[model samples]
Target: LLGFYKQYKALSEYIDKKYKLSLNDLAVLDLTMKHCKDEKVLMQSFLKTAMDELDLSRTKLLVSIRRLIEKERLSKVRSSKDERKIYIYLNNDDISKFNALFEDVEQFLN
Candidate 1:
């Protein structure tokens, strides 16, 4: 049970030891990216998009993604035709940061 928790812990530790993400935080960030990379994703789906990818419930995941958006690392831009819909995009800074973190994680995995 809770094998995912242990994997999160290990990833968190690896991220912390090698970069800036605290162990738990890295798991959140990675999950966010995984959601973004899924096929034919919309620009602005609800936080459920990412949460679903993580197999997490909506509430918990939404809050974390909200924080990431506020950080300006991720953004929620309104749709041109539908102001009701928001699109999520990573800023240049976040893209750079994610690339670095991904490299570290890849190295660790290998």
Candidate 2:
């Protein structure tokens, strides 16, 4: 569990530096990351589910979503098969790089 905590702490610090997201926003994002199956998900579906599970108002949720998009932590895209629908997903390359940094942190601690 120490490894997990180290990774989580490193990730949270990195995200805080990059996005300046609130703790609530970070918690919401963590939930989305865990729950989304394919690393991609519909915005409305995520919002509805998050609203049900989190103690966040709809307005706060929308604000956090917008902030994540603006910060480039989450990318917004339209479904090619259905243009009217929108999806959000993590920037995997960026996250992979962040994880690499975490690995480096672990090595340095040793």
Candidate 3:
């Protein structure tokens, strides 16, 4: 069994306690840290990555991540070339602060 959801729950819990994030928000942050870069991720790319890593459907993962942005826990900007596409980025404080908690997960997993 993949136990991917359990992994997500544990990681989400770790992030929640450290950052005071809602589960969905923390999941989004975790996804961003693991998969996002250079200010944004291609929507399809992110979806596939989530599926590969978490064994989750793309729609479910995107909705979870989108909730974070809606709550202002994450932010997004539309791509210049493709108005329908969005590029996600972290706020400076979140990158510095929330990311610190990730080290704990790294150490725990490794």
Error of 2 at 5 (Å): 20
Best by lDDT: 2
The predicted structure with the larger lDDT, 1 or 2, is 2
How well does each candidate superpose onto the true structure, as a TM-score?
0.55, 0.63, 0.60
* lDDT by candidate, in order shown: 0.61, 0.70, 0.68
- Which residue runs does candidate 3 get wrong by more than 4 Å? 1-25, 100-110
lDDT tens digits by residue: candidate 3, 13-91: 7766765565554555687876554466677777777778777776777787777677565667787887788767677
Candidate 3: count the clashes.
0
Local distance difference test, candidate 3: 0.68
Query: Where does candidate 1 stray beyond 4 Å?
Result: 1-8, 14-46, 79-84
Whichever of 1 and 2 has more TM-score, that candidate is 2
Q: Put the candidates in TM-score order, highest first.
A: 2, 3, 1
* lDDT at residue 13 of model 1 (Cα atoms): 77
Residue pairs clashing, model 3: none
Instruction: Indicate the residue-level lDDT of 36 in model 1.
Output: 54
Q: Residue-wise lDDT of candidate 2 within 1-110, one digit each (tens)? A: 89978867776676567557665676666676665524778888888888988978889988988876776655678888987898877677546643554464457445
